[PDB]
């Protein structure tokens, strides 16, 4: 297929939102790097994907 051609979206479709678990641990700056002790901090959601399963330091 392709993506450029004829038909375009409307103003329609109610999306209903679920129970939804809370999310927090906010912090950002444009000269920071999400530094919460380290810039890559694994824990769910926000910013850009992790790949490290870092666990407790001494």
């Amino acid at each position: 297929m392709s993506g450029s051609g004829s038909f375009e979206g409307g103003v329609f479709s109610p999306y209903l939102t679920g129970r939804l678990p809370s999310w927090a641990g906010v912090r950002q700056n444009v000269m920071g790097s999400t530094v919460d002790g380290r810039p890559v901090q694994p824990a769910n959601s926000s910013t850009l994907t992790y790949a490290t399963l870092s666990s407790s330091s001494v």
């Binding site: 209903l16 939102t17 679920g18 129970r19 678990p21 999310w23 824990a43 769910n44 870092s54 666990s55």
Partner: protein, 99 residues
Amino acid sequence: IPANATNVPISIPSRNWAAFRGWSFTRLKTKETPSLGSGFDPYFVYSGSIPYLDGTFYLNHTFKKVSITFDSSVSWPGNDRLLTPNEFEIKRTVDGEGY
């Protein structure tokens, strides 16, 4: 669903539950079976172990959480059963509460 963590919506309609038992789940990888009832497909891949038709699984450790709810405002593990009660976790990267 492709590329990056978190949540996006739905809600789903109509009726029927009763004589319901657990939920069981594992992560697979798109591998050998193209779909059952077919053969010689371009969807056919690999030739190793099939974790879908064998009891093999090996990505059953790649889960962070698995919230299960109902309705859209009822949370099934509700009643404060767990110490994080609105979701079942499976692994916690960075633990500070000793859970």
